[PDB]
Ligand binder design. Structure first.
Ligand SMILES: OC[C@H]1O[C@@H](O[C@@H]2[C@H](O)[C@@H](O)[C@H](O)O[C@@H]2CO)[C@H](O)[C@@H](O)[C@H]1O
Ligand SMILES: [Ca+2]
Length: 386
């Protein structure tokens, strides 16, 4: 049924990743996943058979309040990162450790210092960032996890760990990079930014990183077709960075809607009025979208190393009509994007919009944990659909 046009020029070792950070909180909430045959199966095995070769996991320093109540969003700390890493490694997939260097969501608007670093002068915070990265990585190595890449920050367009001055941000980038370098010289160091469609943005950031001697290997970008411009532009801005600074480039996050329906009762991020939707909101449209960004990154040439799909399995803990019972699960296991307990850390955003999954309709599995046909885009990009 599904159609996937072969990606021309796709390298054989192209990174095909997925970020399934919410998996632990979901399994604790009772969510189960299946394979093609329809029998319960570890999602990591299913991802592996679908052609995925990399797993990305977000890591928050201390995503809990004083009493130990999870902030939600998967309650992703180092402990869960290790659980995920071991399963990724056990299923022959490399790991991408994504340090937010914050106790909660880090993005263009939010780059809050971890609670533990709130009262530290810059120098001590830098030491703390370095130390944290160093210890976290060692713990993962001790667990036998195969770490292929580390992200020093997440969508750090305007800040990092409470800092907004680029001179200080670069020192933090370097502090983190340091720890990676000291851990394993083979691990790729990536910096992650977003809004590639902004005129001159990526060019300015790359040049600034250069002027501040920031030591990194991959210039990563998020790419959500809804707001981030054309694929042509994406290729253009990433190619300029690659050519100009000799860096590898990749898409650290991307996704698309396979349905307009909200499966758990918590309003979804997409689709919405105003957003750009070049592909139909169907399983086929979702597949075209993924295949296209893979093509766009591949078009960069030798520098385009891969694409990570963001949260392809953040499915509902229950039906939309069971909203109130769902909240119980979200609140208890943090299997939603945020819990009310996060209000102390982020009162402005999480504080009033906390709840369930905002991306259940952009998963590569249906609302019941069955893999959608679009899951096989990872395989068909190499050959195309017969
Ligand atoms: O109720 C939905 C909720 O989503 C938030 O987005 C969070 C997070 O803050 C982002 O950084 C991340 O990219 O996506 C998750 C949800 O998938 C958003 O910030 C809130 O305003 C709400 O839209
Ligand atoms: Ca939802």
């Amino acid at each position: 049924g599904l159609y996937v046009e072969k990606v021309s020029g796709l390298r054989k070792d192209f990174i095909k990743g997925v970020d399934v950070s919410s998996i632990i909180a979901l399994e604790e909430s009772g969510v189960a996943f299946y394979n093609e045959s329809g029998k319960k199966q570890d999602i990591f095995k299913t991802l592996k058979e679908a052609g995925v070769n990399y797993v990305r996991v977000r890591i928050w320093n201390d995503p809990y309040d004083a009493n130990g109540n999870g902030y939600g969003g998967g309650n992703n700390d180092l402990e869960k990162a290790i659980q995920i890493g071991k399963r990724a490694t056990a299923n022959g997939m490399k790991l991408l450790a994504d340090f937010h260097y914050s106790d909660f969501w880090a993005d263009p608007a939010k780059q809050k210092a971890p609670k533990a670093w709130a009262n530290l002068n810059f120098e001590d915070k830098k030491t703390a960032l370095y130390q944290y990265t160093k210890q976290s990585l060692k713990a993962m190595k001790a667990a036998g996890i195969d770490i292929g890449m580390v992200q020093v920050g997440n969508e750090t367009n305007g800040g990092l760990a409470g800092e907004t001055d680029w001179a200080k941000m670069s020192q933090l980038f370097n502090a983190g990079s340091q720890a990676v370098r000291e851990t394993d010289s083979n691990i790729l160091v990536a910096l992650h930014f977003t809004n590639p469609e902004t005129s001159g943005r990526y060019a300015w950031i790359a040049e600034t990183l250069h002027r501040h001697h920031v030591d990194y290997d991959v210039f990563a970008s998020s790419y959500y077709p809804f707001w981030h411009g054309t694929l042509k532009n994406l290729t253009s801005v990433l190619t300029s960075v690659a050519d100009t600074y000799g860096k590898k480039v990749m898409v650290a996050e991307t996704s698309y809607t396979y349905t307009a329906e909200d499966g758990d009762g918590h309003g979804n991020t997409a689709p919405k009025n105003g957003q750009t939707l070049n592909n139909p909101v169907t399983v086929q449209g979702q597949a075209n979208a993924v295949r296209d960004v893979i093509q766009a990154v591949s078009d960069v040439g030798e520098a385009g190393i891969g694409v990570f799909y963001w949260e392809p399995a953040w499915i509902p803990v229950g039906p939309a009509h069971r909203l109130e019972k769902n909240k119980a699960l979200w609140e208890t296991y943090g299997s939603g994007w945020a819990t009310s307990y996060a209000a102390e850390y982020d009162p402005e955003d999480a504080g009033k919009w906390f709840g369930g999954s905002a991306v259940d309709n952009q998963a590569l599995f249906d609302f019941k944990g069955r893999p959608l046909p679009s899951l096989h885009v990872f395989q068909y990009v190499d050959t195309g659909t017969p």
